């Protein structure tokens, strides 16, 4: 009966019980008989993905792995994209495969490369959309029924990129989803955190296996508090990422020294349509391609005097990177070229300053 | 040259650095680049120089740092050997994932001896231990796992900590702590550390930790930690002062049967705590001739100690488990705070008369 | 000179020193020295951001607003000076004037010779007040230094310095830090003056002293502090409107409000609070009051969740006024809170 | 019970968050003064045996809101010329300018706190010990003093001795305050002050002088870290004065020093006073080198372990060479105290 600002500020709520709106935060470690604060966020992400239950862990990779450690076994079998972001790339080639796990890489835009990637036991659909780091997009609902099919697999979704303001992938049949809490959704780049959301059944077990036992991936309290206090404005912050980005992407698009840009907005984008009947919103995460290749993405990034140069995203600063110069400097061609890091590309995390301070730190720096 | 004091107080400084004593806190999520947590660190460097490891790496907590260290070194296939009495991901997590798991009495070195396969890639063991306080000897046992060119000795150091016992100069190759307990000292942080060599920490931070557990210590709760150990030295002796003088009242008491600590010479493995420990600790373990009831009253009339599962927080607590592996029914488990010893004592043997 | 969220996100940071966009947080007390041969690093970033933003020279912290207006007020007076203002000194040797800051003559005809300070508040029923012109006027002594808290505005609505005041004092508790977390508060002028504020008032006077990790806080809170502005107006004016069709509502953005014409001429923006008067008594408020489920019952201003107050039930005040204080939420969740209970 | 009971369990609300730690109230608006602070009061105050406390967000905070609470244009204040720095500012360019007389007397003479004392003498303010020699004053008999004048309130800066050692309001003196920021706190890492007195007193400065007069606000995270520096108070002053103790032997025997000022030295001007008020003669020691004014410099310019620093009361030793700095004063610390002895001799050498 309630909106997203409302919901992010209000939900969970304890303030007939301490007086404050604001909760306390419980710094403790040993409770005493005869976490308050972390459950209230708990209670908030859940909300807004409108889902039964949340789960608080100290990073992302502690959200996704305390999952899966909890879902899987020796012999199960995983389906997951060829690219995902890493350390989730990490976690699924180098990490599962010594415990006996199967994973199987396809593209998961392609529905029918997914169907037939499919197995008895396979205990996983793992999804990211949009993705590093073309923006790929990926059917989430399309995808759900094909792997309920078999009736024992859970689909996992990272709404990272996305957050519960453009997409709720719990209402498309999604089982799982992941958030990064470390980016958009504290929003004020000074947290590592991660958050998971699902039916209370399956987040039960998450934190009593996957969480407890498993990986210990417990959030400071705060932490906590700092992430609350952060999505007291994720409605707004959203508002103007999204706002900001749509402006800059036409500024890229219709630029000389710029060959292509990457955005799920474009109707030139590969899954436009696709984002357009899921997503609410097209993201403020942009990509786009450099016409002087290599040296021009350096020159770009050493000029640029409001831009900062960084790997996360979802901050209030404007951050790009170029990840040919910096991410993937020790790599081969080969490695970078498929998938999908080129000579050219440049990521860009729009911030919230003023659009036109953006550009114009964009425009000087072109040159 | 550095005593303990001076070693917790000031190892790992960056005084050159900031101009400042107290570490900043680098309450941040993205460092920014010249061209194209330190926190935290200053805490692995300091439990390092305590532990007198070459690295010390941190985690959000004990069992963070515990699992991030199994997920490194271990895969499907390997063979594990640990005690009967992190149990569950033992016993139910790592059978889960091809790991296989024998249950010994590491009491006894020689099921050690025999339970150590070839594949056995860890002995991991604890001292004193739970919650009978067991010792066990850790350099005998690292002799016995190290005749296999590949199987690592990790020890679980929380109870003993660096003041009193430290693994790694009796040859044990991995040390964890949960930092929750006497390293914090203060009962407000959840939190993990593991000291080893630089090429097994490193395989921990960027293997077990980046990406099998995420159990990233948030730099607050670093900063919390650094704060606690200027403490530490005079912490643990208090802990340790208070504890003996408590240990006394209790076994020449009338309704207490048995006491638990490892500073008595009737305490079973009394002579290799002797050799090993620097002290005895600060945990009481002792069983009331009343059995339950003893026990859930005694518990029930106490004014000063706490009711709580933790230990090696500044005040004193206590708990009994019976509200089948240990777990005598009337035994009751006293973790010494810091408060001054006739208040405790006091308040034990007012609870006392009430049974 | 950027946009307004781009120098509140951007002013004063010292990120190629630490690595870090975000500022280490000096939770410090006593700063080793190099040879044998008062501030704060954290704390001094939001002073210079507050400073920016006000277009002024200088910052200063203050663990809290009246620790703000206490310690200028230490620093810039003696025994025998005198103060005017608006409708505790006195017991140490200075004389205060009451008077209607809204009558231009009736301030200037108040001015004595010992007139120290004036001192300001726009908006207060919303009471506007022309700060220029009462500023040539109070600049007609020397001696007199202009005093505004610019809480209830912001630096997004108004920048007093720029119309000849000498001294804006923020209780950054309300609108700049945003978050209701904080007590604490700020000070904007020129640089001698505010080292005069630092080195006196704040050092021997009050020793009001903002903690470091406040200072923290504050400077997170000023990171959607554009952003919080924007879409506090405009919640403000969609909800003055339906409030507004209760006898009268008091909001500077109404024509038929008194200051209107000082509002628009120096406030970019009318503000975030209203005050409206309920034509039930005394037990009409309050069962409204006692009957809303979104807008929360507390006496403060500048949240983002709605805060709303029957100064009745919590000379000035009727017993059917009400003071709404607009947070952020989203706009028809408020307006159905406020109507439901209206019923 | 004892003071380590006392300083970890004074003011607990265990029952009610079920919680041994006090959550941190980081909150303005209360829905219908703070929590956490309000526990650290209750425990500044079962430690002086007072019946309130309060906290403001600085030493100064503490003194300066005490100051404009009890006074007025017209009364006059007994203090000492030998005080702390921006207590000696207050005293002296900032209530003289407000209509406050203040006579700067030399608090050990009796004699001359007498014959100071005037009808409208509102406040006669001691320290003790005192900078930057450590000097001492008799705590009962200054107010035994003062109080034969029925207006006249005597306040005590207890910051050095701390409750550990010296509980000035046993001995007659009406207000207690203090600097948190040094051994109270402990960690070197808090600006706070705390105050100490009667419950009609306190009430008045908190609702006077603190809410009108400083707004100097303790932070609820500020007060979080001092409840827990409280945690171990008693050990760290137990740790304190042993360090120093042996300290004040080694360096009232090495050559190259003169005079070694220490309350518990019998040598010391005023050590039978310190011996009756204090339970321990404190972690503060001062000497002087034969060599003055450049074997001071080159002293602390040697030192490797003792750092150079203004503030006392952390757990790291700070030093500091008064002509060098402020225009030789000892914070003994937590460390060592051989390690803190070596670091000494071997800049001694040079």
Same mark, same amino acid.
């Given at each position: 009966?309630?909106?997203?600002?409302?919901?992010?500020?209000?939900?969970?709520?304890?303030?007939?019980?301490?007086?404050?709106?604001? %909760?306390?935060?419980?710094?403790?470690?040993? *409770?005493?008989?005869?976490?308050?604060?972390?459950?209230?966020?708990?209670?908030?992400?859940?909300?807004?993905?409108?889902?039964?239950?949340?789960?608080?862990?100290?990073?992302?990779?502690?959200?996704?792995?305390?999952?899966?450690?909890?879902?899987?076994?020796?012999?199960?079998?995983?389906?997951?994209?060829?690219?995902?972001?890493?350390?989730?790339?990490?976690?699924?080639?180098?990490?599962?495969?010594?415990?006996?796990?199967?994973?199987?890489?396809?593209?998961? /835009?392609?529905?029918?490369?997914?169907?037939?990637? %499919?197995?008895?036991?396979?205990?996983?659909?793992?999804?990211?959309?949009?993705?590093?780091?073309?923006?790929?997009?990926?059917?989430?609902?399309?995808?759900?029924?094909?792997?309920?099919?078999?009736?024992?697999?859970?689909?996992?979704?990272?709404?990272?990129?996305?957050?519960?303001?453009?997409?709720?992938?719990?209402?498309?049949?999604?089982?799982?989803?992941?958030?990064?809490?470390?980016?958009?959704?504290?929003?004020?780049?000074?947290?590592?955190?991660?958050?998971?959301?699902?039916?209370?059944?399956?987040?039960?077990?998450?934190?009593?296996?996957?969480?407890?036992?498993?990986?210990?991936?417990?959030?400071?309290?705060?932490?906590?508090?700092?992430?609350?206090?952060?999505?007291?404005? *994720?409605?707004?912050? %959203?508002?103007?990422?999204?706002?900001?980005?749509?402006?800059?992407?036409?500024?890229?698009?219709?630029?000389?020294?710029?060959?292509?840009?990457?955005?799920?907005?474009?109707?030139?984008?590969?899954?436009?349509?696709?984002?357009?009947?899921? %997503?609410?919103?097209?993201?403020?995460?942009?990509?786009?391609?450099?016409?002087?290749? *290599?040296?021009?993405?350096?020159?770009?990034?050493?000029?640029?005097?409001?831009?900062?140069?960084?790997?996360?995203?979802?901050?209030?600063?404007?951050?790009?990177?170029?990840?040919? /110069?910096?991410?993937? /400097?020790?790599?081969?061609?080969?490695?970078?070229?498929?998938?999908?890091?080129?000579?050219?590309?440049?990521?860009? /995390?729009?911030?919230?300053?003023?659009?036109?301070?953006?550009?114009?730190?964009?425009?000087?720096?072109?040159?």
């Amino acid at each position: 009966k309630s909106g997203l600002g409302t919901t992010a500020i209000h939900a969970g709520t304890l303030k007939n019980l301490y007086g404050t709106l604001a %909760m306390p935060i419980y710094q403790t470690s040993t *409770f005493i008989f005869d976490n308050p604060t972390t459950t209230v966020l708990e209670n908030k992400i859940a909300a807004l993905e409108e889902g039964e239950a949340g789960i608080a862990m100290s990073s992302g990779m502690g959200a996704i792995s305390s999952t899966l450690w909890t879902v899987l076994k020796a012999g199960d079998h995983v389906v997951t994209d060829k690219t995902l972001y890493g350390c989730t790339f990490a976690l699924m080639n180098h990490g599962l495969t010594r415990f006996g796990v199967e994973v199987t890489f396809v593209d998961t /835009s392609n529905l029918e490369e997914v169907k037939n990637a %499919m197995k008895k036991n396979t205990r996983v659909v793992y999804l990211e959309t949009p993705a590093n780091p073309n923006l790929k997009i990926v059917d989430l609902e399309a995808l759900s029924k094909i792997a309920h099919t078999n009736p024992n697999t859970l689909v996992i979704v990272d709404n990272t990129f996305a957050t519960p303001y453009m997409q709720k992938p719990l209402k498309l049949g999604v089982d799982i989803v992941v958030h990064s809490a470390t980016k958009y959704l504290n929003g004020h780049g000074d947290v590592i955190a991660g958050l998971v959301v699902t039916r209370q059944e399956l987040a039960d077990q998450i934190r009593f296996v996957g969480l407890k036992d498993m990986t210990g991936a417990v959030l400071g309290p705060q932490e906590a508090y700092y992430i609350i206090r952060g999505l007291k404005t *994720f409605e707004i912050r %959203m508002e103007r990422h999204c706002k900001n980005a749509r402006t800059i992407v036409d500024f890229l698009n219709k630029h000389p020294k710029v060959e292509k840009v990457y955005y799920p907005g474009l109707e030139t984008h590969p899954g436009y349509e696709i984002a357009k009947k899921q %997503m609410k919103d097209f993201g403020a995460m942009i990509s786009f391609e450099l016409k002087g290749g *290599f040296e021009a993405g350096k020159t770009l990034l050493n000029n640029l005097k409001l831009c900062s140069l960084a790997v996360s995203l979802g901050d209030t600063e404007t951050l790009i990177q170029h990840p040919a /110069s910096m991410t993937h /400097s020790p790599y081969t061609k080969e490695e970078r070229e498929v998938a999908g890091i080129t000579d050219g590309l440049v990521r860009l /995390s729009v911030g919230l300053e003023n659009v036109e301070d953006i550009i114009a730190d964009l425009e000087q720096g072109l040159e």
